Amino acid sequence: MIYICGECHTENEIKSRDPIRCRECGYRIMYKKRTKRLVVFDAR
Amino acid sequence: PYANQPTVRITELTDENVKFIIENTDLAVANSIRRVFIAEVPIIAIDWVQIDANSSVLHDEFIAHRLGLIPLTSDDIVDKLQYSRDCTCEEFCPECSVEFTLDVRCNEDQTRHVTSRDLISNSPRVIPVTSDDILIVKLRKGQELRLRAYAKKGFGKEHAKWNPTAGVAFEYDPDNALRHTVYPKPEEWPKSEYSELDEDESQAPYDPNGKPERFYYNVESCGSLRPETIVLSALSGLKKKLSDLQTQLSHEIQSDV
Amino acid sequence: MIIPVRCFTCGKIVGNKWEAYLGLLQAEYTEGDALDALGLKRYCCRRMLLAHVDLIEKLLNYAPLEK
Amino acid sequence: QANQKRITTPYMTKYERARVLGTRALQIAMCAPVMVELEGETDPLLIAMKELKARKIPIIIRRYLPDGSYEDWGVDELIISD
Amino acid sequence: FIGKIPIMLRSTYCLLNGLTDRDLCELNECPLDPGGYFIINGSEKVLIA
Amino acid sequence: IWGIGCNP
Amino acid sequence: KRHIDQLKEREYNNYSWQDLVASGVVEYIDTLEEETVMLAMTPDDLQEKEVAYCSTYTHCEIHPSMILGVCASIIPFPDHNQSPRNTYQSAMGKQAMGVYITNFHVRMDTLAHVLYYPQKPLVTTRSMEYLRFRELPAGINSIVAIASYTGYNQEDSVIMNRSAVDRGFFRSVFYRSYKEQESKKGFDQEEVFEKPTRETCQGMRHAIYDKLDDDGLIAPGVRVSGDDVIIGKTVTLPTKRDCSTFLRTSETGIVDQVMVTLNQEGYKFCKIRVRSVRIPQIGDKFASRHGQKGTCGIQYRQEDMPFTCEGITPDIIINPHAIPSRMTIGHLIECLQGKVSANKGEIGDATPFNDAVNVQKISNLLSDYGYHLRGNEVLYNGFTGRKITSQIFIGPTYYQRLKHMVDDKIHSRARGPIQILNRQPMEG
Amino acid sequence: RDGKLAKPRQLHNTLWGMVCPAETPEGHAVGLVKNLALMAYISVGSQPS
Amino acid sequence: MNAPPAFESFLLFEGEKKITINKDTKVPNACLFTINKEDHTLGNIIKSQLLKDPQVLFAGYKVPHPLEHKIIIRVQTTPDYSPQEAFTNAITDLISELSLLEERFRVAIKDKQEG
Amino acid sequence: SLKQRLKGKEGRVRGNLMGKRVDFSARTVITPDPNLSIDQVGVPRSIAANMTFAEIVTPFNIDRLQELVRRGNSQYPGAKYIIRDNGDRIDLRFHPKPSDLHLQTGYKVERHMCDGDIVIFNRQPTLHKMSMMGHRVRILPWSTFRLNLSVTTPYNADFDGDEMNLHLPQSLETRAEIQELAMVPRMIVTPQSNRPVMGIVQDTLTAVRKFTKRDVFLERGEVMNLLMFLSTWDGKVPQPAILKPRPLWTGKQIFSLIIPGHINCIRTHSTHPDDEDSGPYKHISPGDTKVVVENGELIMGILCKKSLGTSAGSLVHISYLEMGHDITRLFYSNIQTVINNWLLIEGHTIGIGDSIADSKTYQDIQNTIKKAKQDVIEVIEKAHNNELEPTPGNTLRQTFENQVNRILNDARDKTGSSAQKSLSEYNNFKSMVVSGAKGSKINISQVIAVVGQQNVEGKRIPFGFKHRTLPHFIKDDYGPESRGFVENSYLAGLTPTEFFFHAMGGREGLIDTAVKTAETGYIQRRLI
RNA sequence: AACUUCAUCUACG
Ligand SMILES: CO[C@@H]1[C@H](O)[C@H](n2cnc3c(=O)nc(N)[nH]c32)O[C@H]1COP(=O)(O)OP(=O)(O)OP(=O)(O)O
Ligand SMILES: [Mg+2]
Ligand SMILES: [Zn+2]
Ligand SMILES: [Zn+2]
Ligand SMILES: [Zn+2]
């Protein structure tokens, strides 16, 4: 999938079985990024 | 054996408030008119939210809650609009709902206050009572809120977002003459605004034959419906509930026969 | 965290009044006089502005996850 | 024991009533023939209560005396506590 | 090198020490956080007197 | 909290 | 006056507490020295010449209220409550929901509760300023009537206004974080994050694995109902074993954040946070700042709640029977002072030993704003509209939502899982 | 906590101003777990030389 | 998780009758009307209007349980009168009162404005 | 070791055999429900859907059970399992199983728990047998168990976060046994003290005291509304007590319709003058005290905890001993319903005005405190001058302490009596104390007049510091303020030293409770 | 068609 970087906030695409290191910053904390499917919220 | 003939005198009428007096009416009828003010007057409010992108600090359902609480002008088309359950079409359509859109991004350095003004309606009659503005969220630079909402007809019994009124002030017997409230020390108690007593007399003399009449109302609008039309719609809705009850009662009596 | 839309007790819209309240406090107005100028009459509505703690400004200091 | 020399109480105890009613209820729920004419009662426990009131439960309680002996008291013979 | 000593947060040897609230926010640390705890295996532990 | 004969 | 004036200009005057200590104005005294020191609680009342109790005072307390700790310092008018009630309030204030920290978004902590709309108390102690209670408050000011309305506030329960609850009153967010680490123990046996396959992986469950993304981790923003698969982890079997994590039963949340990192070992480590927005129900527990708590007995809408002449309906109705045996008069004084503060626009001062704030002064202040001296109000019955004969005590009191909620405690068992050793039903 | 003696748990007079009288856990630890008062400070230690 | 949906308060589920009439055997000429999905709003109005009638010996309403949504109205009338007729007449009287109120409120509105 | 496996609590013998974890049990928080009957309990839908009762398929219930099976586990009034004759458990949750939906006689449908099911309800600790009682299920929305408030006292339960366990019998035999041996109406009277375990409590008690005063007069509409909530009503409106000028019933006249059958009882109200019985107006009782119920009609009197409470000879106890347990259940429920609706009319509250007393009352309290402090000073001077002589069996220290304690306690009692004299009829502290619903005269006195002496270990506040109580007091001060006497009331507010001493007293009480639990538990286990 | 234990601590009535 595409993981946003923790520090430099640049999306990087990491394949499975690949070390979690952002290109150009090296931070080891990535975030999965919001889903394409949309969820309905009742305003209640 | 028949209903009394009530009389109305309107003391104050402002875009936000209606102060009126209903005389020669029962306490039950007056209280239930107040109750219908609060809970059974139809209004338009957001009840469907789909957030495409929410990078604000507030989570998605927080934003949805705040959007629902935002009042929307419902003066005329709320009577025309149908309930979603009644509408034949699946989900929502122009007859059963109104669509709103929000696409705000804080490109500038300064904090962007997303307001109700940023909500854009597909139909001009329903606008978020913008004509300050209700603040939905504050966006830091690089934060974006995108969402689509659908507003539907409903009344406050479902949810407080559909309350058309802010505060319904209801008072009867301004000077305690029916002794419905028994003061332990009458002098300590402040006089009502509608009180006709002299300053020396704390309470009016006990009226043994009296009955609660001459009810005083102050209905404050939330801005969605005009304060006059809140009262008119409440009276009409209570009448419609009674007529539906009578129709079902007649049907069941015929069935029993 | 952010000023609630509608007073809990009655439902009068108090969400549009927080920025004006802060501005009137900056002017010179006492809290009570600013609350009166904004139109808040019942102590229920005055509690909404008077007791509000605006944490959204502190949360906006942190950098966004996606820029 | 015999009909003579019955020393236990004639009244049915609360525990005997509970166990007899439960046992008769379970039997009725297990398609056992019902002695009383149920008046549209479809609950086995209610039917058992109805039989108990009419003294038609076909059970005899064997009460064990502390010396080891036993006395057989019919449910009809016992006086209903309630 | 003989070992590693866990550092109490916001103590003199913590990296957060001597940082203004803006700098603390840049590091995603609360200005109001008191400190006085250790992060061991990712969990905050407080020594009880 | 009351007295010696009462409660603490 | 020189010292106090310099401290008043503290910033840009480079005068601090350490300068006060260096001057010899203040001194640190421990218990052994407290045994040999004559103290005055207050300078004016005690040091000044009167009928001479002691004429050899060696020290003076800076302020008596400092004898309390952090949790007891939030209690307003603590000298007007029974002593066990202040202990109860300390314990319950450790359990109130609020914004625990401002960086709560960054942190992935299991079991985090954060309140939507925290408010600072209308009646506040001065020492609260040094506890940062204004900065990160926990609880909301609420119009509270002390009345017996429909019997659903009896014992210690509390009736609540459903309209207020619908407008955001005491709404909270519960974040649960789940951690999973893929690891290799055997040389041929490894754990991999992946979407489990019905045929490829021997172990499976009815639970939907579709929500899992390609990496085996649910993306943020996906609704996850109880027993759905948050993380998909499969172990090679020397075909595969399913060690995928599932939601705690009845969690029913929405994924907030999914972080993927490498732990110290170098193995992949995943943390997933789930949001569940909890609205107040009729089992949830709310407590005042005075040591008397209660579950929500029932929720009535604004049409049903009793209303005053002005149209105000109490957010919370508490039974009067709580007050007498517990003797938490600080609660009543706080309601009166909160009414005065909300009408005046100031913030009430409830420091423990003020001696300048009597109840009579608060009553006289409330009289000026058009209310009854003692805070009673003529309430109209919501159902029938008739005036309630007994005038009812109404005022703004600060209430806290305790972390104990009924949804977390409801449980039922029917032929479920069974232990291996005892072959008896399991625990928990 | 197991000990039922009501001597070590009671609020001593010397706790005045240094341990909160109100704030104590309730249960097996009544009066055994305490909390500092607001102005209380604990000596860090010094050389007696 | 066990929270009832909001629409349960006023929406009849399929197969639910708005009104069910059961006579009361304890007393002659008495009836018990069970209205479903209704609250004090209608119950108090109807009880008051029934009380105004001279041939109604008894009129009362109750909500059997606050969490559930139902209204029970007991009406006992004199001989030569039917409780069902009393209920119908009460409803018609309330409707007429409310329509008169609407007309007079509209007139009051038009007079407060425009002068 | 093997011994450790079998030895103690959590061992096999005690932790696994004498007691064990069981199926078909549900725990959740409890909230009040005045509308439910005594035996009824309120069960959330989810708890009722998880728990099941196996019902044997018979020819007379085959249709209903087949409908339940068709609904399945998803629709709530459904069945979770179908147990065949062979013992094979067809599962209705997993997949339709259309061939296996068929039911024949002998099959067991595990239907969901429904309204009317008998369930044991329990609160820990089960100190007496009334702590486990059989309740009839009623399914209500939301997630808490809901129980009548008269049933709170046997369970020792208050709705402040308490939880209750629920055990569902799984057989008709054990269901009947529970229903007869343990049903709540059958548990009304305890064998421990031959008194009713349950009585009118909390709001209902205060509202009953107010309702049964002579002053209460109810108009026609209020009478009809209250009669609406009376289940045992005969449908006949009693002729009003006052026919003219306007028809007005009385609270006693309506409560007379609650009292079942023909019950005869004579009690006395808490505020009964001892002089009235000896002197004239024995049967007139100017204060409307006394309580006379003849032929099930309340002729005269005001009801309180002495008449409607848990005590021997109460109206509740006589109803149980005379009319039976079912009729007594109806009696409790009707009292609660109609008196709660009258309370909706009259209302009840507590405020600051209740704590306030007259200015003269405060002045008298202050004068009493001044005189007491002066007398303690005089006693201390006698002791210092060695005039004091030891009381037999006591040291000079002990006799001095006893004299000072006597003076302080007498002053405290006098201030309390003055505060109680100040109380009006409308005072709500007094209303709750008189009804017996909550509070005591000690609490009123402490609220209004004087908190009283703070004593630790049966003595005034000890000399914890060296020969003084606090550093603020001078050494060797035996006066009231130094040793713990609190002259300020809770309303007035404790001074800082009084605050600390009060904290010491409260701490001692809390320690006593916490230590008490374990010793009493061990004793109870040994006895059993 | 379905996920171990110990131990500790912290809370609950
Ligand atoms: C009334 O007695 C109950 C029971 O005895 C049961 N219980 C509670 N804790 C324990 C325990 O540790 N061990 C055992 N065996 N039983 C226990 O709890 C007792 C009271 O405790 P409390 O005094 O705190 O009740 P508030 O007076 O405080 O009630 P508020 O106003 O908060 O609702
Ligand atoms: Mg409790
Ligand atoms: Zn990066
Ligand atoms: Zn449509
Ligand atoms: Zn308001």
Q: Which CATH number characterizes residue I50's domain?
A: 3.30.1360.10
Q: Which of G415, G421, G369 is nearest to G396 (CA)?
A: G369
User: What are the structural domain ranges in chain A?
Assistant: 1-44
Extract long-range pairs of G244-249: CB within 8 Å, 24+ residues apart. Answer: G244/G196, G244/G209, G244/G216, G245/G178, G245/G180, G246/G205, G246/G207, G247/G274, G248/G176
CA–CA separation, G146 and G158 (whole Å):
10
Residue G232 in tokens? 């998909």
CA–CA separation, J284 and A5 (whole Å):
89
Chain J residues touching residue B26 (CB < 8 angstroms): none
User: For residue D68, which amino acid is it?
Assistant: G
Residue B23 in tokens? 């005389």
Task: Tell how far the Cα of B79 is from the centroid of ligand 4, in angstroms.
Answer: 15
Cα–Cα distance list, G58 to G26, G33, H39, J467 (Å): 11, 11, 19, 18
Q: What is the DSSP string of G94-142?
A: TTB-S---TTTTT---SSEEEESS-B--SEE-GGGGGGTTTTS--SEEE
For domain J202-346, the CATH superfamily is RNA polymerase Rpb1, domain 3 (1.10.274.100)
CA–CA separation, G256 and I108 (whole Å):
55
Question: Which residues of C carry a binding-site annotation for Zn(2+)?
Answer: 7, 10, 44-45
Task: Tell if the CB–CB gap between A43 and B51 is shorter than 8 Å.
Answer: no
Please report the beta strands in B119-197, taking only residues with DSSP state E, as ranges in sequence order: 120-121, 135-139, 144-154, 165-171
Q: Is A3 annotated as a binding residue?
A: no
User: For residue J393, which amino acid is it?
Assistant: G
Between A and B, how many residue pairs show a Cβ–Cβ distance under 8 A? 39
CA B88, B93, B95, B97 torsion-angle sign: positive
Q: Which of G347, G345, G398 is nearest to G141 (CA)?
A: G398
Q: Which of J267, J44, J296, J289 is nearest to J163 (CA)?
A: J44
User: What are the structural domain ranges in chain C?
Assistant: 1-67
In this structure, are residues B216 and B194 in contact, taking their beta carbons and an 8 Å threshold? yes
In this structure, are residues I58 and I24 in contact, taking their beta carbons and an 8 Å threshold? no
Chain B meets chain J (3+ C-beta pairs below 8 A): yes
Strand K nucleotides where any atom sits below 7 Å of a protein CB = 1-6, 10-13
CA G258, G261, G264, G269 torsion-angle sign: positive
| Residues 6+ away with beta carbon under 8 Å from D37 | none
- Judge if the upstream peptide bond of residue J390 is cis by omega within 30 degrees of 0: no
User: For residue G348, which amino acid is it?
Assistant: G
CA distance A8 to chain B (A): 13
Residue nearest to atom 4 of ligand 1 (CA): J156
CA–CA separation, J320 and J315 (whole Å):
9
Q: DSSP secondary-structure letter at B205?
A: P
In this structure, are residues C25 and C4 in contact, taking their beta carbons and an 8 Å threshold? no
Neighbours of J120 (CB within 10 A): 17
Neighbours of J148 (CB within 10 A): 25
Query: How buried is G273 (Cβ within 10 angstroms: 0-12 exposed, 13-18 middle, 19+ buried)?
Result: buried
CA–CA separation, G296 and I3 (whole Å):
14
Backbone phi, psi, residue G399, to 5°: -120, 150
Q: Which CATH fold topology does C1-67 show?
A: Arc Repressor Mutant, subunit A (1.10.10)
Structural domain containing residue B147: 43-160
CA–CA separation, J243 and G281 (whole Å):
48
Compute the 3-state secondary structure of chain E and give helix, strand, coil in percent, each to the nearest 5: 10, 10, 75
CA–CA separation, G96 and G99 (whole Å):
10
Alpha carbon distance, N-terminus to C-terminus of chain J: 29
CA–CA separation, J274 and G66 (whole Å):
51
User: For residue G63, which amino acid is it?
Assistant: H
CA–CA separation, B3 and I91 (whole Å):
10
In this structure, are residues J319 and J331 in contact, taking their beta carbons and an 8 Å threshold? yes
SS3 D63: strand
Q: Counting atoms of ligand 1 from 1, which one is nearest the CA of G322? A: 31
Neighbours of B74 (CB within 10 A): 29
SS3 G353: coil
DSSP alpha helix (H) spans, chain E: 21-26
| Residues 6+ away with beta carbon under 8 Å from G392 | G145, G146, G147, G306, G376, G377, G379, J347, J349
Neighbours of J394 (CB within 10 A): 12
CATH number, span D1-82: 3.90.940.10
Chain I residues touching residue G281 (CB < 8 angstroms): 3
User: What are the structural domain ranges in chain D?
Assistant: 1-82
**Residue bearing tokens 């009655």:** C10
Backbone phi, psi, residue J361, to 5°: -60, -45
Q: For J60-112, what is the HEC assignment? A: CCHHHHHHHHHHCCCCCCCEEEEECCCCCEEECCCCCCHHHHCCCCCCEEEEE
Chain D meets chain G (3+ C-beta pairs below 8 A): no
**Residue bearing tokens 């696994």:** J16
**Residue bearing tokens 């003595």:** J459
In this structure, are residues G336 and G375 in contact, taking their beta carbons and an 8 Å threshold? yes
CA–CA separation, I39 and I42 (whole Å):
6
In this structure, are residues J339 and J204 in contact, taking their beta carbons and an 8 Å threshold? yes
Compute, in degrees rounded to 10, the torsion defined by CA atoms J518, J520, J525, J528. -170
CA–CA separation, H27 and G419 (whole Å):
31
Query: Are residues B117 and B177 both part of a single domain?
Result: no
CA J312, J315, J316, J317 torsion-angle sign: positive
In this structure, are residues G167 and G287 in contact, taking their beta carbons and an 8 Å threshold? no
CA–CA separation, B56 and G105 (whole Å):
11
Q: Which ligand is nearest to the CA of G324?
A: 1
Estimate to the nearest angstrom the gap between the alpha carbon of J436 and the chain centroid. 11
Residue G278 in tokens? 């909890």
G20 sits in which H/E element:
helix G17-22
Task: Tell if the CB–CB gap between B184 and J426 is shorter than 8 Å.
Answer: yes
Residue G156 bears catalytic tag: yes
Alpha carbon distance, N-terminus to C-terminus of chain D: 26
Task: Tell how far the Cα of A21 is from the centroid of ligand 3, in angstroms.
Answer: 8
In this structure, are residues D21 and J176 in contact, taking their beta carbons and an 8 Å threshold? yes
Backbone phi, psi, residue G144, to 5°: -120, 130
Cα–Cα distance list, G21 to G14, G24, G27, I10, J474 (Å): 14, 5, 6, 71, 27
Task: Tell if the CB–CB gap between J171 and D26 is shorter than 8 Å.
Answer: yes
CA–CA separation, J152 and J136 (whole Å):
16
Q: Which of G313, G165, G278, G142 is nearest to B160 (CA)?
A: G165
CA–CA separation, B204 and B182 (whole Å):
12
B49 sits in which H/E element:
strand B43-54
Residue nearest to atom 11 of ligand 1 (CA): J517
Residue D25 in tokens? 């209820």
CA distance C16 to chain E (A): 29
b/e per residue, J195-221, with b = 16+ CB within 10 A? bbbbbbbbbbbbbbbbbbeeebebebb
Measured CA to C1', the nucleotide nearest G91 is K11
Structural domain containing residue I79: 1-115
In this structure, are residues B175 and B203 in contact, taking their beta carbons and an 8 Å threshold? yes
Total count of domains within chain B: 2
Side-chain-facing half-sphere of G398: CA atoms under 13 Å: 37
In this structure, are residues I6 and B159 in contact, taking their beta carbons and an 8 Å threshold? yes
- Judge if the upstream peptide bond of residue J245 is cis by omega within 30 degrees of 0: yes
Chain F residues touching residue J451 (CB < 8 angstroms): 1-2
CA–CA separation, I86 and J442 (whole Å):
56
Query: How buried is H24 (Cβ within 10 angstroms: 0-12 exposed, 13-18 middle, 19+ buried)?
Result: buried
Catalytic residue (choose from G156, G166, G215, G407): G156
Q: Which CATH fold topology does A1-44 show?
A: Rubrerythrin, domain 2 (2.20.28)
Pocket test for ligand 1, best of G81, G153, G293 (most atoms within 8 A of CB): G293
Interhelix angle for D44-54 vs J172-182, to 10°? 60
CA–CA separation, J23 and J20 (whole Å):
10
**Residue bearing tokens 């069996």:** J393
DSSP alpha helix (H) spans, B70-188: 77-80
Does any CB of chain G come closer than 8 Å to the CB of residue E6? Answer: no
**Residue bearing tokens 């007293």:** J505
**Residue bearing tokens 């875009």:** B15
Chain J residues touching residue G402 (CB < 8 angstroms): 161
J527 sits in which H/E element:
helix J496-527
Query: Are residues B85 and B136 both part of a single domain?
Result: yes
Q: Which of G280, G292, G294, G287 is nearest to G407 (CA)?
A: G280
Q: Is A13 annotated as a binding residue?
A: no
Extract long-range pairs of H36-41: CB within 8 Å, 24+ residues apart. Answer: H36/G69, H37/G66, H37/G67, H37/G68, H37/G69, H38/G66, H38/G68, H38/G69, H38/G70, H38/G73, H38/G127, H38/G130, H39/G62, H39/G66, H41/G28
Query: Are residues B169 and B79 both part of a single domain?
Result: no
CA–CA separation, J380 and J460 (whole Å):
15
| Residues 6+ away with beta carbon under 8 Å from G134 | C53, G120, G124, G128
Task: Tell how far the Cα of G167 is from the centroid of ligand 5, in angstroms.
Answer: 11
- For K10, which residue's CA is nearest its C1'? H25
Ramachandran assignment for A13, one of left (phi > 0), alpha (psi -120 to 50 degrees), beta (any other): beta
Q: List residues bridging with J90 in a β-sheet.
A: J82
Q: For J382-395, what is the HEC assignment? A: HHHCCCCCCCCCCC
CA–CA separation, B242 and I92 (whole Å):
8
CA–CA separation, B50 and B101 (whole Å):
10
Q: List residues bridging with G145 in a β-sheet.
A: G317, G394
DSSP alpha helix (H) spans, G191-281: none
G146 sits in which H/E element:
strand G140-146
Q: Which ligand is nearest to the CA of B91?
A: 4
Q: For chain C, what is the HEC assignment? A: CCCCCCCCCCCCCCHHHHHHHHHHHHHCCCHHHHHHHCCCCCHHHHHHHHCECCCHHHHCCCCCCCC
In this structure, are residues I94 and I42 in contact, taking their beta carbons and an 8 Å threshold? no
Chain D meets chain H (3+ C-beta pairs below 8 A): no
Residue G165 in tokens? 């609850």
Compute the radius of gyration of chain C from its Cα atoms.
14
Which residue does chain B place closest to J428, by CA atoms? B184
Experimental method for this entry?
cryo-EM
Backbone phi, psi, residue B106, to 5°: -95, 85
Give the distance, in angstroms, between residue G96 CA and nucleotide K5 C1'.
Answer: 34
Residues with CB under 6 A from ligand 1: G 156, 292-293, 326; H 27; J 125, 156, 158, 160, 517
- For K11, which residue's CA is nearest its C1'? G95
CA G359, G364, G366, G370 torsion-angle sign: positive
CA–CA separation, B251 and B253 (whole Å):
6
CA–CA separation, J320 and J322 (whole Å):
6
| Residues 6+ away with beta carbon under 8 Å from J278 | none
Q: Counting atoms of ligand 1 from 1, which one is nearest the CA of G291? A: 32
Neighbours of G290 (CB within 10 A): 30
Strand K interface, protein residues by Cβ within 7 Å: G 91-92, 94-95, 203-206, 227, 246, 293, 404, 417, 419-421, 426; H 25-27, 29, 33; J 91, 94, 124-125, 158, 160-163
Residue J422 in tokens? 């100040």
CA distance G112 to chain B (A): 14
CA–CA separation, J127 and J520 (whole Å):
10
CA–CA separation, G8 and J423 (whole Å):
49
In this structure, are residues G57 and G51 in contact, taking their beta carbons and an 8 Å threshold? no
Which residue does chain G place closest to I48, by CA atoms? G384
Chain G residues touching residue I1 (CB < 8 angstroms): 250, 252, 407, 410
Residue J108 in tokens? 């067991």
